[PDB]
Design a protein around this ligand. Sequence first.
Ligand SMILES: Nc1ncnc2c1ncn2[C@@H]1O[C@H](COP(=O)(O)OP(=O)(O)O)[C@@H](O)[C@H]1O
Ligand SMILES: Nc1ncnc2c1ncn2[C@@H]1O[C@H](COP(=O)(O)OP(=O)(O)O)[C@@H](O)[C@H]1O
Ligand SMILES: Nc1ncnc2c1ncn2[C@@H]1O[C@H](COP(=O)(O)OP(=O)(O)O)[C@@H](O)[C@H]1O
Ligand SMILES: [Mg+2]
Ligand SMILES: [Mg+2]
Ligand SMILES: [Mg+2]
Ligand SMILES: [Mg+2]
Ligand SMILES: [Mg+2]
Lengths: 526, 49, 538, 525, 211, 106
Amino acid sequence: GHRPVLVLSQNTKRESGRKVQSGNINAAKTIADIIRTCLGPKSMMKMLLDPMGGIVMTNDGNAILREIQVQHPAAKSMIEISRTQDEEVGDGTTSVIILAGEMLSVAEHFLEQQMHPTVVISAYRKALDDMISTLKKISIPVDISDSDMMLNIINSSITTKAISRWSSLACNIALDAVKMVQFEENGRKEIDIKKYARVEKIPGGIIEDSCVLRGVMINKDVTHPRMRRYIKNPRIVLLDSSLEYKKGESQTDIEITREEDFTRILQMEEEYIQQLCEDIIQLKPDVVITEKGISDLAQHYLMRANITAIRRVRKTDNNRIARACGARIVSRPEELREDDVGTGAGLLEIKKIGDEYFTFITDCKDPKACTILLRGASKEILSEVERNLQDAMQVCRNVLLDPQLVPGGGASEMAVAHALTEKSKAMTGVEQWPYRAVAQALEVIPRTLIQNCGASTIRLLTSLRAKHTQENCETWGVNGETGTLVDMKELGIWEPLAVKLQTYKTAVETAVLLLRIDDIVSGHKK
Amino acid sequence: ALHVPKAPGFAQMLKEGAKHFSGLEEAVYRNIQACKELAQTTRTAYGPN
Amino acid sequence: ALHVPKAPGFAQMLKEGAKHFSGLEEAVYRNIQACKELAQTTRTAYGPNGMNKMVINHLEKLFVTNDAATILRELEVQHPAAKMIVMASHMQEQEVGDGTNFVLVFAGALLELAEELLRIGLSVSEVIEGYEIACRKAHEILPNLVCCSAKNLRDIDEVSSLLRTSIMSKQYGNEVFLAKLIAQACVSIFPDSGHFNVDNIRVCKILGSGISSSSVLHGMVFKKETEGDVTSVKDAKIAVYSCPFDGMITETKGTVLIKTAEELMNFSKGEENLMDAQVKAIADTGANVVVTGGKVADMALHYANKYNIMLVRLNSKWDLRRLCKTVGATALPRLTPPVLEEMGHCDSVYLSEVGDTQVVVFKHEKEDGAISTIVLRGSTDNLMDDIERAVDDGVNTFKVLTRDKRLVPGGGATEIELAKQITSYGETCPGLEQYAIKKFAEAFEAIPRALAENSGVKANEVISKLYAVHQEGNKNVGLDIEAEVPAVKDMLEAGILDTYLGKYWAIKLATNAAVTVLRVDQIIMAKPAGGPKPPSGK
Amino acid sequence: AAVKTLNPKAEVARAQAALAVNISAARGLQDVLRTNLGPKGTMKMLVSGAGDIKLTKDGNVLLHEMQIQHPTASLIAKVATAQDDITGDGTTSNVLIIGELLKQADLYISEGLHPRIITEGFEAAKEKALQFLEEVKVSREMDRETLIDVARTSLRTKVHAELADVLTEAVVDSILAIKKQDEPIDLFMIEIMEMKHKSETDTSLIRGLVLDHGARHPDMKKRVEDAYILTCNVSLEYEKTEVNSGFFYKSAEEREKLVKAERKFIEDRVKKIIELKRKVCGDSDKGFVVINQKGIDPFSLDALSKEGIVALRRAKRRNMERLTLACGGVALNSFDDLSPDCLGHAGLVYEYTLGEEKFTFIEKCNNPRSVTLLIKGPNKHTLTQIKDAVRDGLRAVKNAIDDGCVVPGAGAVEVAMAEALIKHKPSVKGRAQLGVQAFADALLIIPKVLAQNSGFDLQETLVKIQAEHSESGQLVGVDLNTGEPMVAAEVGVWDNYCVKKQLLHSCTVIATNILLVDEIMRAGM
Amino acid sequence: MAAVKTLNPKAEVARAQAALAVNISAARGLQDVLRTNLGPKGTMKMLVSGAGDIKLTKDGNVLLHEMQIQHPTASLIAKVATAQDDITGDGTTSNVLIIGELLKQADLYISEGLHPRIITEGFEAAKEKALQFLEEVKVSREMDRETLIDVARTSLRTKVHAELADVLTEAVVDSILAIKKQDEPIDLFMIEIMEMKHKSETDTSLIRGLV
Amino acid sequence: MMPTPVILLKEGTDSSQGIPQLVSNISACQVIAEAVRTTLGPRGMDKLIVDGRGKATISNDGATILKLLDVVHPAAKTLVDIAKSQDAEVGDGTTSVTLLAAEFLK
Ligand SMILES: Nc1ncnc2c1ncn2[C@@H]1O[C@H](COP(=O)(O)OP(=O)(O)O)[C@@H](O)[C@H]1O
Ligand SMILES: Nc1ncnc2c1ncn2[C@@H]1O[C@H](COP(=O)(O)OP(=O)(O)O)[C@@H](O)[C@H]1O
Ligand SMILES: Nc1ncnc2c1ncn2[C@@H]1O[C@H](COP(=O)(O)OP(=O)(O)O)[C@@H](O)[C@H]1O
Ligand SMILES: [Mg+2]
Ligand SMILES: [Mg+2]
Ligand SMILES: [Mg+2]
Ligand SMILES: [Mg+2]
Ligand SMILES: [Mg+2]
């Protein structure tokens, strides 16, 4: 016997000192190196094996990072910041990771050179503030009324994905969807593309046939074949309550003693259904769409009035239809009003694609919701196309909200680095060295672009750095396709200011978070 | 769609317990890291102090 | 240099338990070998001199029989080419009812000769084309080989003679008696209308007195006992009910709501009076026998006993429907008295003791009726099962005769004549298909060879004599099994005949199975699973 | 590796390893599926884990039923699944073209070339090839002969010659029967019914419906000559109240009264049906058939059979529309207001019994817009193979009717496409000409595989065909009986234009995406 | 799965196209490993034994012995390279590369249904023609000191560092010229190779005697 | 015999064919007859059979003794079946049927 006595429980480890900092920085560098080669217009794609047996062939950094599992907590923090960048702005996920990895890599030097992490953190925060100032300075305005400028911005956003082959069609689709989704009510502007901009993937066909509809498409068919599958100018009526006969909430029981009470009860059930159908018909609609089941007898009474019925649509699909055709979902048909009747859909067609029926409510006038019908080679191709379309729509929304633009291809990075170095020339304290280190660490984006392009990093980067020292060279970047220095006033690669601001903020703050950390303790039970 | 097979050629012909590190990142950086670690272990015994 | 790695490509991507067979040697020859093995297993039970086989299935149920279809069914066949040949045999059994062993033997012979042709140089496609051409030629020749027709199916003696050949292959020792039994049973059935139903023939197996004590009854026999006191009637007026012999109740929910003492005291008396009135109303129509498909109430049983009414409870709805057919009644869904047209009639219903089991007999006297039953006596359950299989074969033969009345000589005469004619045709066909046609002709030799081997004589002498006699011009000469030496005799005179449809369908199905097996070039077997069978198969 | 450093139990293939793995998988799939192409191909035999036998020749079925656990194989299987779902043909050609594109690309990648240039060449070659395919298509009025030719060119590749000949007539007649002018063809209106009692050549087309269920009452007539069809979706069995009624009685007489009075609701609808039947046909000459999507209890069955009415219960949901289009009635969900004008008409209704299963035939319809295909065979695998073949044939005929054009087959179209691509190659700038050449060589795989399956050699047959095409300019294919060049237009070897376009698009897209994959991970655990 | 497996169930067999695939895959793997060795611009390889001994080399034969390979075709190619090294002492990497490329080019046509026998016949004819061309193209020169220095450089530069190779050139040329007798075979056993571990790598030299 | 990678019957299937299996069947019938041989005649003797649960059965009836024996030999079970048949049809002679049948076979 005599079991050992000790302060902390077993399986409780603890390491401290330079080892923890080095391990955290190495984990961040490994996370960066995982997706270092997936940046730029010449990025290669990666194939990821889902544990559930799926395959994710993707170029996006966030999907790659979220599809892998790590044990080191610093890698978990890096994945979390990647997800945060993806959610906040939409793109820039594989740039912020690289930036954070480089910043931690250059901070490791000062950590090893007897400098306390707090000084490094203060220098990092001053550098971040000056980066924000420089980006706000070098930005240019954009008028959202010019469709060509918006298309160019979306193209520059999607030149690095696999959809650059059909870039023109993709940009048109994304811009149209964002414009359709844009809404304002009660003075509250709203661009909510995660609910009212739906992407539907139907494998087969050709990618060139993909388009955005002026309406909503659902995978539903008429309840009864006698119903019309083609109505010219339908009057939409939406419901979210069953058209059947159902038990009440209170516990209720009948007690039948007379002979004719059973038939009377059944007849009153039928009459209740008939009354509901008559209440619906009194508005004289053309179709009825419900989120809950519709009884066969109700279907008969609806067909008697020449009304097409769709049985069970989802909540989100019903909301999209309401936004598109101008209807208003109601629960009790007794309280139906003419305002709730959905007029504005220019055509309702129920056609067959492949071996399945699909319902189209397209041709709407002024629709506030849309569906993007994607057709392609297979499921994974369509998934990647959908991810690229999400990136494009997020970029379009960011530009619509924040109409300033900054040069791409590392031109902004080099301009900010040069401005930071010029400002650091004036400081005299010990904080200047980490400040300049961050300034030059910001140059990783053009270096990675040159490395991915296959060109030589050293001389190209040196020439670019020399070029940025002149009076007006803030728009000089690199070609990701030819490996040459070009003015981005000519190449036309521009990025939203919000995306760059979010990227720099997230990278610097992740570096700050991982610099503060020491004395890792693990193994304790909840 | 649940396992990544070894690439045909040298990867398959490699012995059971052997290891093969090739390229810059896999070999040169790892060797530099190991040498840095050794120097770090020995560093604190340098000089009169 | 101590291991051979798997070849890159499909070999490495194959699953752990899967097997892949490609080419001639790995797939076609192996399938031919498996089919040959199956044919060899079933070969020894062919013909009248075939020997029974004891087969123990996975449930330790013992089967002793010489029926090829049953033997294949009870065998755990795992090779899938043999599985295809077994499906062909079972399809032959379902379509015709006899000739399954012929199908298996012909398929095996065809596949062996195809293997020989493939070895000598012929391609698979050429062999398949030649086999199809020879099968078409054989189907063209076959109608010309018909020697006689049934020409009458209402006769007892002639139908017995027709079915004697069919039921001589199984139960060789005593086939005349079974011929008389099955002929009487089938002649009672098969009314003026041409349609004949196999299901109308019932078989009841009762242990004890040997198969020579079996008989045919123009009615139905049920192995149970009467519910009431009455055990025999003479002028039965059966009223068949599909409902339980009890007062029907509500389908929603029954609740006796009592609110006064008088209702409580009167409820049981009223219910009993209602039951008595219903039973008396049923009896007043003249019905002295009542058959019900459900539970029998005690009060209903008492009141049926009071009015001298026979009660019989048939659990199976198939039995109730068959009784309705054989008596001439309709199963009333409620307990209302039957009107004159829906009250069945039987010449005698009584409780009887046969051997050990208690039976209820619905017996007619006139030699007709919708359903007739055959009671099988014997000393062993397996023996009666074999006799039942023979009876099924005879009934299927009678049904085929009703379908088509043409007959062909048996005992290998038809096979030998077909082989001779197909060889003569193939000798005149130029090109590589002549080898396939000749091999298809030679495959017909497997039937007389199997018969000669089973009878204990030398097959080569029998086949040589058959060719000699057929070349002389006698097309109705086959093997003579009643001899200790290879000998032949005219089989039209001997009365040994085979159904034309049986031979036609057997040849067609065997050729189709052989061609289908030959068409296979690659096999990809998944890893065997220990799953509890597909849900559809139950 | 970085991933293995972060996750020790993770599998990684990077740089040339990923390309080698993907190309090896594609080559293995291609090698397996080479023998499928063409009518001279070899039947594959598939045994499942439960011992079920599957005889097939389709690329998609083979892909689904091979015991393969490879990622690239999964991607190609999904591509072929989409190909089959939309067009219904070209899966084997899909796999062959993907594998040959990957092999030809590797032939240049192994010499230091970068995959991006190959992908650019592939894109340019695909654009030119689509232009040429648009140029070469034959716009024709789809009469019966052309549809028969297309159905033959599908079914002969799928099944035996005589079976294909029968299925051609069956499929073409069925499609022409259900087809409405300037209206999309609905393939749900063709029942594919299986029966297992005759030879494979007994498959035929019935101008009506075949139902896998018959009358459940023995007293109902088994054959009705002149019938009136009442297609309904009304429950004719006892239904309990939704609100938990229950019965309360104080004596046996009240129990009897409540038992008699609880059937009144269903009895009313049965009486309505009986009154309609009596009014419509006052004699015994005409018949009355009731097909119900819901159950019919024995009481209603007896009540109907006492009036000489054949009642079928638990019919299929699509059978409502099938009977409405074929017989010509109105599917009723309630008997509130039923009139003789909603009754369908059938010129013959009879029941066929097969073993323990029963079937109902509804033939001699006036103008059946929906028909059925009766698949007959002695085995289950034969039935499955015939069903797959008729699916392929129906898809081919529907595609031929939809797209008014049709493309010459027998390998001519891709030979001409490759020659045009070679001619156009100098117009491509840079080193994308290597990708264009690889695309042309990959397109040339189909005549090669056809030559092998016919028993010939690639080099001689291919050079003969290409020389004939260059000298004459016609669309010359592969004669699988002699190997000589042959113009597929006269002999009637046709291919679907949509199938070729989908093949080009999907193969190019998937090959480009696979070639650009440089790193494979399995690190989700 | 084959005839052999029936007689011996525990047998591994590769037949027909599988045999060619296995052999060509092994040859291509060996070629891919040994591509980086060729030329003075080749890359040094680190070879660590089971005991932990470190060997740095770029020699093809030395690498072939130290590769952790257990393939039959690799064994055959290693035997061929060993014979090359034993008799001539150079060209092992060239052997591996040429064999791999020969097999790859042959497969490039074999995959098109061509029989390997025709390829082998073409190989024999091409080998005869190439031997004739090699005979006519050779440069017969009087082996003075400069030519021997050039040959020694062309070998050592591809074997070691440029400066060390430069020193070893004079070392080896002077040794050979010292032990060589006129119109007699050269006995390489008469050149002692002794290792000392106390100076820099450029301190190696030749001694007119014995150590 | 050869391994035959794909086998026809399920693995573990036992097949016996020819004269030896018939002789074995006759021997099994002899063994079955011997178990009830001494229960015949006025000088017969009783047999005590104990089941798995420990309950004993003492009987001179041949059919009872044969039924209490757990005979699994397919050919030997025919003697038990005919003894039960004789018991059902007649009720006496269950010992004589087995002796007669086994003696015929011998
Ligand atoms: N044609 C181009 N030439 C040079 N650089 C480009 C080009 N297109 C995009 N870039 C640069 O590539 C970056 C986008 O790469 P991407 O893979 O989208 O990374 P992220 O997903 O982090 O945005 C942008 O910062 C932009 O400056
Ligand atoms: N008395 C007989 N003499 C000669 N041959 C006979 C006689 N009776 C039947 N046969 C032959 O035996 C064959 C029947 O074999 P059988 O055991 O019934 O196999 P299956 O059940 O598959 O038909 C018939 O082809 C017939 O020619
Ligand atoms: N009678 C024929 N003669 C020559 N070539 C043919 C003939 N029939 C079909 N083909 C060619 O063979 C190919 C058959 O391909 P198939 O096996 O149907 O593959 P998939 O099912 O994937 O379409 C077609 O591309 C067609 O061009
Ligand atoms: Mg981006
Ligand atoms: Mg028989
Ligand atoms: Mg096809
Ligand atoms: Mg050398
Ligand atoms: Mg006694």
